[PDB]
Structure 1
């Protein structure tokens, strides 16, 4: 079998080769493992960016601000990315990380219920400030990679304080890959406002035999970089560890 010195070296190298700094936390049962080329990022706070869509969806659905088949219409105004200029369900908006749809959901939820719910779930530092529609991009909401992997663990196991059905509905939105009888569920994130910029991929592997292994990748994104680096580093890491 492969030494842990070798696993640690290989996974550090994936971050080194992307010329970034980052950490990937893996949780097996109750045990947290930190890998990568910048381990001390593990308990530093960063903005959640689009990772917050997972919780935005849980809250909106739990509180009847939307259903999973409702179509959010594009209002016809130019959006940052052309793929966002279409009508979509929460689930399609989740896959495209369409922030305008999630901003609409946050506004339906409203600042007051959003604050209560985020406090109730104990997400990150739990502060959302005064603007219901932008608190996940440039503050004041922050969260550590450890807190992200613990949130994933909670969602993967239906332990968050929302109906089981709400959790299943949001989980069905998060399937991003199947790989040898393993399913990967995750939400990506790219905070382009903050400096430096933060990249996330937080989720879990559901293995053939039913076991769920949560992970959170957290790295620095730079002007040169492609978004799929987050996926590539993650898949390479989970494979190196034989998780997938």
Structure 2
């Protein structure tokens, strides 16, 4: 009961940061962590926007799942970004360059319309189609991120069933003890204070879907693993894993 949520508050505390974890089962949401006010606070989606970025591109034939985005050879911030990748490969590695290319294919006209049509966050993408999710006006609360993941998990987003099933496969991580796990990590360092994301959902053995969105403040020098660690540890303590 209230004891399960006391360890979660310590999990964010032992990481020396303030964060929240939103869990949605059915149409009900529950928040955990040390800064519960974060659940209703808007932050830049960062790489979590790639979920919707891929849905728009595939639905409007801007790209395909087998298309290969060749690396130009210029040095990148991460070594995993220095390779030719399909849209799916770029999703796991969080290759900003590939989805900036896709965003330029979609264009500000279609990008802004589709974001508003789905109702993603504040639905304000500004005028630059290649950076609105990292620093731009686009902001979203962790509650809206978990609600988005739950709808994508059940394929109830306003996109074709084919496209939703393709983006789902891009986000598949692992199957831990019979539970299939889908998630998309995010890290917006170009906003102060920095924000850390981990949005996804769990497909339990009987098919039940449990969506989640971890949101914490990416402090200076904090390890990027903390997002995945707190999320996995929390779901285990919540009986979901």
TM bin, normalised by shorter chain, reads over 0.9
| Corresponding residue number in structure 2 for 1:72 | 69
1:65-104 to structure 2, matched below 5 A, reads 65-104=62-101
1-structure distance, mates of 2:113, 2:168: 22
Secondary structure at the counterpart of residue 3 of structure 2: helix
| Corresponding residue number in structure 1 for 2:5 | 8
> Number of residues paired by the alignment?
241
| Corresponding residue number in structure 2 for 1:35 | 32
| Corresponding residue number in structure 1 for 2:115 | 118
1:194 aligns with 2:191: yes
Q: What is the aligned-residue RMSD (CA, Å)? A: 0.7
2-structure distance, mates of 1:175, 1:160: 18
Moved over 6 A (4+): none
2-structure distance, mates of 1:127, 1:72: 28
Residue 31 of structure 1: how far off its partner (Å)? 1.2
Unaligned 5+ segments in structure 1 are none
1:47-196 to structure 2, matched below 5 A, reads 47-196=44-193
1:233 aligns with 2:230: yes
TM-score, normalised to structure 1, is 0.97
1-structure distance, mates of 2:89, 2:147: 25
Secondary structure at the counterpart of residue 147 of structure 1: helix
2-structure distance, mates of 1:82, 1:16: 31
| Corresponding residue number in structure 2 for 1:208 | 205
Secondary structure at the counterpart of residue 100 of structure 1: helix
Worse-matched range after superposition: 170-179 or 54-63? 170-179
1-structure distance, mates of 2:155, 2:80: 32
2-structure distance, mates of 1:166, 1:106: 16
Query: Which deviations, in whole Å up to 9, do the C-alpha atoms of 1:36-64 show, x marking residues without a partner?
Result: 01000111100000000000000000011
2-structure distance, mates of 1:179, 1:221: 26
Residue 167 of structure 1: how far off its partner (Å)? 0.3
